[PDB]
Amino acid sequence: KTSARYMELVGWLVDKGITSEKQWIQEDQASYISFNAASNSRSQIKAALDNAGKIMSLTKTAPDYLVGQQPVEDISSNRIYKILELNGYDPQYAASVFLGWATKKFGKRNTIWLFGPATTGKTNIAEAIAHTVPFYGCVNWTNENFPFNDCVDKMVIWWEEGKMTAKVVESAKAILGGSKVRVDQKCKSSAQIDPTPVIVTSNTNMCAVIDGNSTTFEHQQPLQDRMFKFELTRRLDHDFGKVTKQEVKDFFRWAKDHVVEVEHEFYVKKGG
């Protein structure tokens, strides 16, 4: 009775696409109606749903999800290639670097840092790329005590606001460096931050260690060695935008199907 129901719920959760509350309400909306019409208690169902969500968040990361089912042939039908050609960089090399960084094949340099203000248009593209996946964790830097709130234990962790001070750079260098360690949040919560690809998209200089109020350059070499620098030249135009998911998947599949030379340095040269 209970075991069969739990197995059926696990099978229905595995053979579907439920993640957040909005997606679950938009997809299968009859579950809430059935629960309201039946009994007002589903502890086993809630536990099974939580287990399925944890298995989906810890199972597939980004490489098993960004693999498309059909590679595109027309390179002019993608906005990413046009943006890369207008900015002044190689599109194939950038795609290969992105595929190598998202697969966990770089090593210590597992953090991509961007440059530019909020009027460049890259923030919307980054938000769309972060929301196109299932689990997503935004790094809300609002206090100087706990930098990671609800962004731990997800799929893709990205930062869109907040500046790291001098009291958090020592922890960021060990968290974003790509090492598995168990860290306790508040008191009754102890998670394990694993090595995942985290993209940093801000405006200020991330390598400048802001020691409270001033700026002290005492450990910029490790932050520069374990960090990247991808600058954007051409900004976003008017009447052009809205990053979807099928085009991104096709671009990822085309970049993975044709791998070329991939470099490993700090400052990216003007190639292409």
Contacts of 241 (CB under 8 A, 6+ apart): 121, 124, 125
Taking alpha carbons only, the member of 268, 186, 179 closest to residue 227 is: 268
Residue 150 binds what, of DNA, a second copy, none (CB under 5 to 8 Å, by partner type)?
a second copy
Instruction: Quickly list H helices, 15-90.
Output: 21-26, 30-37, 43-59, 79-87
Residue carrying the six token digits 């809300």 = 140
Q: 117 among the known binding-site residues? A: yes
Residue 40 or 76 having the CB closest to DNA: 40
Q: 216 among the known binding-site residues? A: no
Q: 121 among the known binding-site residues? A: yes
Residue 39 or 69 having the CB closest to DNA: 39
Q: 118 among the known binding-site residues? A: yes
Residue 128 binds what, of DNA, a second copy, none (CB under 5 to 8 Å, by partner type)?
a second copy
Q: Considering only residues 197 through 256, tell me which ones interact with DNA, judged by CB under 7 A.
A: none
DSSP designation for 120: G
Q: 256 among the known binding-site residues? A: no
218 in Cβ contact with 209 (< 8 Å)? yes
Token pair belonging to 224: 């520069």
Cα–Cα distance between 140 and 164 in angstroms, integer? 11
Residue 31 or 78 having the CB closest to DNA: 31
Residue 221 binds what, of DNA, a second copy, none (CB under 5 to 8 Å, by partner type)?
a second copy
Beta bridge partners of 157: 137
Beta bridge partners of 181: 193
Cα–Cα distance between 153 and 102 in angstroms, integer? 17
Q: Considering only residues 5 through 64, tell me which ones interact with DNA, judged by CB under 7 A.
A: 38-41, 43-44
**Closest distance between a second copy and the C-beta of residue 133, in Å?**
11
Beta strands 156-161 and 136-140 are parallel
Residue 188 or 242 having the CB closest to DNA: 188
213 in Cβ contact with 167 (< 8 Å)? no
Instruction: Establish if 187 lies at the interface with DNA (CB under 7 A).
Output: yes
Residue 44 or 59 having the CB closest to DNA: 44
**Closest distance between DNA and the C-beta of residue 190, in Å?**
14
Cα 213 to chain centroid, rounded: 30
Instruction: Establish if 76 lies at the interface with DNA (CB under 7 A).
Output: no
Among 1, 182, 238, 242, binds DNA (CB under 7 A): 1
Question: What share of residues in the chain are helix, strand, coil (percent, to 5)?
Answer: 40, 10, 50
Residue 158 or 230 having the CB closest to a second copy: 158
**Closest distance between DNA and the C-beta of residue 59, in Å?**
28
Give the residue ranges of the annotated binding site for ATP: 116-123
| Contact footprint for DNA (CB under 7 A) | 1-4, 38-41, 43-44, 186-187
Give the residue ranges of the annotated binding site: 116-123
